[model samples]
Target: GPLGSALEIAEQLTLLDHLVFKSIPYEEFFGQGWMKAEKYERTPYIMKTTKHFNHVSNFIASEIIRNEDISARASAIEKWVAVADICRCLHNYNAVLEITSSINRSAIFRLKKTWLKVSKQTKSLLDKLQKLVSSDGRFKNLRESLRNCDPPCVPYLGMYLTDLVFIEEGTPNYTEDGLVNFSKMRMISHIIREIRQFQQTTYKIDPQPKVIQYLLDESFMLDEESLYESSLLIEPK
Candidate 1:
């Protein structure tokens, strides 16, 4: 409606330095006739793995998991449970970072490649994480000082491995409906109720919960529904 080049929106679009346009048209691959019935297929295996990762994240937040253990199980969901004790000890230390970041919001980044792939949703986030890694009094666990701190929120190919190789199948499903195991959907309702906590009151910067959740919900939903609607869409054979 805005002629696809509205000056108003154009200003915002220019903020991004690298925006990708894939030649692989989704319709061509999946067929335009196949309208999205849902976000990524709600699978029990994905769901159970998601839940287990969250549980491990919680334990790590509680200080149960230590530095050595945390790094060891960083990529392995199965290993996360074993290091739960050490991970529990890790305090969020940065609420702003947590709330603003959709990547870790659902323990979905258990796989680094999976995380980097979906992370391309926001160039701002991608740049922000890089800055955070270089900022002071943040990410101290990984580095002694900010010096040359650069973290790529955006993922490149081969960064993550397929589940067939790393993850095991058959896990407990969290969705009682037997639909999909999207923990974000289950958790969002709870977060929605607590949305005000995210608001920046005076010194506390209020992050727009709806915006973050929209990315999360859509990211989760589209993956299951549209199959390749996301920046991270991987094709099925």
Candidate 2:
């Protein structure tokens, strides 16, 4: 079901499609809202991250709460895997992984009985993402993900900004030569530039669209200094 929805959105986004735009500045996205764009109004997938993820996550939790039976938990796991694949295909990699991480943790201490019903493939996909981000210094899986992505991948942009802030403010580590972590800055800058590059080559018919530095960061905290699980996890509140 989630795959069906994701494919529908991806089909709508094809280059030169009716929703395509000719010239929309990236800065404008920060000004007015694109959350309610006519084409995407029907679904939460491409809308504002906070609302979209919250809705998806809450629904899954609600399913479990309503009934923790094998049928219900298995269905939830299937939906999660489908959603993760959909988000990954849509280049919403951050959502794919973050959602997986949240589900994995919840299944651990909270849903021990429920987790036994999850599929093997679903568990493996979740594990792969966790390893990608939380791996020892090598970050081999992380690098592979970025390298294999098609050009113009629209990553969940919030994580990039949050990681930047975490490096600058949350963590005290800095180059001996300066207050700034130029290397980290460059890495984040490069990712944003990649997003812009995809926009540059596009022919568009139309429009579209936060981290306060920290409170808004929605990424899976992959570092030792990362915020607590409660702070980063998405769920009903």
Candidate 3:
């Protein structure tokens, strides 16, 4: 059942007839990182695919302000501002909850009523936004999920693992978009480097060395269909 989360993620992304992206197995994921290449085609084999979301331009034209394309950027900026507002409200609520056990019981009822009002209005506005983008319904699930992660912070389980204060004020979310394969590789490298030399120094595992040697001998003997199990041995995979 837990495997279903991966299926849901794939369903939400790049489900069209043709895909232009790259993917690889999760076991090797830390090594390859979040790759963006032509070779990551969908096949019977492999784990996840990485996509190159259209890059943010490095430079705008000299006459950007005077050009018509400026209007499109202007619209994005406006929407970014709106999203920022909602995010700030959500953050404000979070910061307070971080300080105390809960809101004052006396004012809790009023605050909840206010949240309900705000939630209704926000959902109404989101419903209208589908027309501005595409009516295809592709992004609707993701957009709606923002409500759970954003304002009011529904589904209490998200904050269960880490305390809100330890999360810090300026720390960005790890799941934020735009991490490349190289970026993920570097991140993994850094984490690996954090491991201690003593950790690798000990050659210890379950089943004592004598027991392991015996098991290896039995395995090799079985593979060869040998009459003598004592002579057979295995090294490593």
Identify the candidate with maximal lDDT.
Answer: 2
**Model 1 alpha-carbon drift over 4 Å, by segment:** 1-94, 100-108, 116-124, 129-237
Cα displacement (angstroms), candidate 1, residue 29, comes to 60
lDDT of 2 by residue, 1-237 (tens): 656653443333332121122133344232123333652443222244444445434444443344435567566666666656655655545555545655654433255445667778877776765675453443455546766776434344344434444444543446776686666656555654655664555332232211122222334323222222322232212
Q: Which run of 10 residues does model 3 get worst, by summed lDDT?
A: 54-63
Candidate 1: C-alpha lDDT: 0.27
Per residue, candidate 1 scores C-alpha lDDT tens digits across 1-237 of 322222222222111100111111222211111123541342332233334334323433222112124333332322222122111112111221222233343333333443343323243443444344323433443233212322211111011112112221233234577765565343333422222222211121234454333222322232222222222232122
TM-score of each: 0.18, 0.49, 0.18
List of clashing residue pairs for candidate 3: 22-40, 34-181
The runs of at least 3 residues in candidate 3 whose Cα sits more than 4 Å from the true structure, single-residue gaps closed, are 1-25, 28-30, 33-52, 55-75, 84-237
- lDDT by residue (tens digit), candidate 3, 1-237: 422432232222212101221122223323222232532442212222111111101011111111234344333223322332332333321111211111111222122322343334443444443232221353343323433543222111112112222222234334356444454445444433322221222211222444223212322211112211211121111
